[PDB]
Amino acid sequence: MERYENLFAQLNDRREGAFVPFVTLGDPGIEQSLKIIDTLIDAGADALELGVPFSDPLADGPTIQNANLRAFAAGVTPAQCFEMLALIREKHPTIPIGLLMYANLVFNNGIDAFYARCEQVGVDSVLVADVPVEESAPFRQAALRHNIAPIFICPPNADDDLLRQVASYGRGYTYLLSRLPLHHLIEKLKEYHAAPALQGFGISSPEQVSAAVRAGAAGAISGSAIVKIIEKNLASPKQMLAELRSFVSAMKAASRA
């Protein structure tokens, strides 16, 4: 499918950045997680990034580590996550859905079969956190064979060779790490015809969304800030959704022309 391409074309026509929340699937339970995701969409999320709980989430900080633990406490499995993904896509036909995966979960029952399942449920992209571009060939190949965009992290100190590899190998969007001047990286990625850049890591406030767009990025990804709202409001599911709605609304507003 062409969900990211259609989204970015539409946003470009509106002179608008993308706002993309990250949550962990099944945090703090399956039911609540599905409601959280609908709320994120209703509040104005342009795309989603969704994590599958994994025993050893090396690339995640404390907030998301805690989300993973909550999902495990609720007994959430990858199989259940894929059931959730099919339901989410059934409700929301055009929003791009990206997964944030660890390699073992992709490799476990066969790389090709993993990407085929993503295609069946209507996922658009997969970022495998612990697969650097150097090791990416079988993952990128399987992704593209099954109409899935492989997403790569571009570190802000990336050398020219890395920029060229990320530009060639990635699809959908380029994940530009917050932590060289970002605008220069953004310009180089454009020069190399990379997928549009979304800035991620540490994006927690509206001014950071506007700054990302001003620097020339196509948009911004926020995770810990969203997940913290879940953690803070575990005792009050209704308040949790209200606060998620307010936050996402504010963050999305910061992206509009």
């Binding site: 612990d130 650097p132 090791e135």
Partner: protein, 394 residues
């Protein structure tokens, strides 16, 4: 791009987040340079000889083998400073840290043994050392925590995940990803992402080199087999490396069988797990059916790394090395046997290798065979564990 092959056949690689690749590439370059640098080699040799006490003895065990056609030698890594072979490679990695201009060390530890080795090397070389250790392990390993603190290391309890070894590995990597300009990650076995399996082998290979020279001197030939326990793979690859091209020499790796393979309560991923990708490598893992990483179980905490070094998986796949398992009870009997018949208290880790040699002897007592067991460490640390089990069983 790398200077060296990151794989051993299908096993190994560099499965880390992109942000860590420059750290691995820097380390690989520094290692390749060091290996060509006579001054680095001389400094390492000086530490090994004058600080760690190399070469270590090769002890013949006549009392154990009496009445059989087995001749058994023990390579006495138990006599190395720190009481285990770990000291060899931490001294080399500390020198690599200094070569790269780093003044700080990060290390992981399970039940504290690598933490102590890292702290002693850091103290000697004037490096500031911080050690990540699962909170569960901190609580249970007071002696090792105290040793690390006495040696000036900062011990950081890890409360994330299940608060054990793999969580400590995770936290050490997270730190390093930010701090690698100034800090070196001193990985504790011959596993993880390239270049660690290679570096650790090369910084342990003097075990097998000395064993070869000592057995030629004493017996006039090579061993029929060399036998080593396998938790992560460092002491075993250090014994095996110099013999790989001697095709007559058996290479036998002994994983912990725990309560028995059939119980599932074991630490034998090479022969009884399933290949996965974690700890920065493609290797046999302990894992659930759906790919969540699990724990190894052994009476010996030092054998609890839930995967195995990729070079062992490779040597197995080509049939150059053979891997077996030994249960808790087999290891315990070998521990008691060595204490009583040779007056050496072996680490429970090393007791697994000895137990397999004892079986080799006992099953076929008229088979002529010349065997070397890598006695990877001493077992003072294990006397409480052993006491408790013997007393509970009456």
């Amino acid at each position: 791009t790398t200077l060296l092959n990151p794989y051993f056949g299908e096993f190994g690689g560099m499965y880390v987040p992109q942000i860590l690749m420059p750290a691995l590439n820097q380390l690989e370059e520094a290692f390749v340079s060091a290996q060509k640098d006579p001054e680095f080699q001389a400094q390492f040799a000086d530490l090994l000889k004058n600080y760690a006490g190399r070469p270590t003895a090769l002890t013949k065990c006549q009392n154990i083998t009496a009445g059989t056609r087995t001749t058994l030698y023990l390579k006495r890594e138990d006599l190395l400073h720190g009481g285990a072979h770990k000291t060899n490679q931490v001294l080399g990695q500390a020198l690599l840290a200094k070569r790269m201009g780093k003044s700080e060390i990060i290390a992981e530890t399970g039940a504290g043994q690598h933490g102590v080795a890292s702290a002693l090397a850091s103290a000697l070389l004037g490096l500031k050392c911080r050690i990540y250790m699962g909170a569960k392990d901190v609580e249970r390993q007071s002696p090792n925590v105290f040793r690390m603190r006495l040696m000036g290391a900062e011990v950081i309890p890890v409360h994330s995940g299940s608060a054990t070894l793999k969580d400590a590995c995770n936290e050490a990597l997270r730190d390093w990803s930010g701090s690698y300009e100034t800090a070196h990650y001193m990985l504790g076995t011959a596993a993880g992402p390239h270049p660690y399996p290679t570096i650790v082998r090369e910084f342990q290979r003097m075990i097998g080199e000395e064993t070869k020279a000592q057995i030629l001197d004493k017996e006039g030939r090579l061993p029929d087999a060399v036998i080593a326990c396998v938790g992560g793979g460092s002491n075993a690859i250090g014994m095996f490396a110099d013999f790989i091209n001697d095709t007559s020499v058996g290479l036998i790796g002994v994983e912990p069988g725990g309560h028995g393979i059939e119980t599932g309560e074991h630490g034998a991923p090479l022969k009884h797990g399933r290949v996965g990708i974690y700890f920065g490598m493609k290797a046999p893992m302990m894992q659930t059916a759906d790919g969540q990483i699990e724990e190894s179980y052994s009476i010996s905490a030092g054998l609890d790394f839930p995967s195995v070094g990729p070079q062992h998986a490779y040597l197995n796949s080509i049939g150059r090395a053979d891997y077996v398992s030994i249960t808790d009870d087999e290891a315990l009997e070998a521990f008691k046997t060595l204490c009583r018949h040779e007056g050496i208290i072996p680490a429970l880790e090393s007791s697994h290798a000895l137990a397999h040699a004892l079986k080799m002897m006992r099953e076929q007592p008229e088979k002529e065979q010349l065997l070397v067991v890598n006695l990877s460490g001493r077992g003072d640390k294990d006397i409480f564990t052993v006491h408790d089990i013997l007393k509970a069983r009456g």
